[PDB]
């Protein structure tokens, strides 16, 4: 046996509430880390003004959560480095800038409606 890479302190506590209505759900493509250049199709779910992506539609357990209430979603620039079209990325101008591509232009726009708005702090 070998332990480690676990951690011994709680800094942030975020999780999809059990009694929280699903805002919007849909299969999206999450860009890979700076390392490998590729896309990884996963199940995206918006709940509690927050984004939650699961390995599959099963939604067994939240793999990673990202606060949108502190971001400004917006369609990728006309000079972005994304081959696929109808893409959208969110930036918080302090932490980082996430990206999300869409198969059709109808899904992208629709997503921005929920994400973009849910992001606003006003």
């Amino acid at each position: 046996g070998s332990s480690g890479s676990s951690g011994g302190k709680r800094s942030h506590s975020m999780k999809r509430n059990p009694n929280a209505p699903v805002t919007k759900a849909g299969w999206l493509f999450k860009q890979a880390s700076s390392g490998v250049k590729q896309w990884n199709k996963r199940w995206f779910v918006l709940v509690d003004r927050c984004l939650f992506y699961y390995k599959d539609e099963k939604e067994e357990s939240i793999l990673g959560s990202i606060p949108l209430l502190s971001f400004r979603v917006a369609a990728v620039q006309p000079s972005d480095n994304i081959s696929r079209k109808h893409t959208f990325k969110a930036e918080h101008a302090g932490v980082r800038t996430y990206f999300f591509s869409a198969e059709s232009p109808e899904e992208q726009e629709a997503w921005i409606q929920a994400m973009g708005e849910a992001a606003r702090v006003q």
Side-chain angles (χ1 to χ4, degrees), residues 2 10 15 19 23 25 35 37 40-43 50 57 64 66 81-82 85 87 93 98 100-102 114 119 121-122:
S2 295
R10 282 78 62 161
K15 207 185 78 174
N19 270 255
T23 311
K37 295 274 204 271
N40 292 249
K41 193 202 176 61
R42 293 270 155 83
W43 185 236
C50 293
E57 61 82 38
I66 302 150
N81 270 241
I82 315 278
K85 302 180 170 163
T87 303
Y98 280 101
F100 310 110
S101 174
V121 196
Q122 196 66 261

Side-chain angles (χ1 to χ4, degrees), residues 39-98:
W39 290 88
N40 292 249
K41 193 202 176 61
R42 293 270 155 83
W43 185 236
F44 270 51
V45 180
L46 189 74
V47 165
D48 207 70
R49 204 151 296 196
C50 293
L51 208 156
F52 308 124
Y53 68 89
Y54 299 88
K55 59 156 157 287
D56 296 302
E57 61 82 38
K58 294 192 88 84
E59 295 151 308
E60 285 281 43
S61 272
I62 297 167
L63 312 173
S65 293
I66 302 150
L68 283 166
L69 154 67
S70 299
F71 277 76
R72 48 159 295 200
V73 181
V76 291
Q77 281 193 296
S79 70
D80 70 340
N81 270 241
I82 315 278
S83 281
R84 295 155 151 69
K85 302 180 170 163
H86 326 293
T87 303
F88 49 116
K89 47 86 204 160
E91 91 204 62
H92 163 241
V95 179
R96 79 192 284 176
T97 306
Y98 280 101

Side-chain angles (χ1 to χ4, degrees), residues 30-40:
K30 189 163 189 286
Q31 210 210 71
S33 76
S34 166
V36 63
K37 295 274 204 271
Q38 72 172 103
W39 290 88
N40 292 249

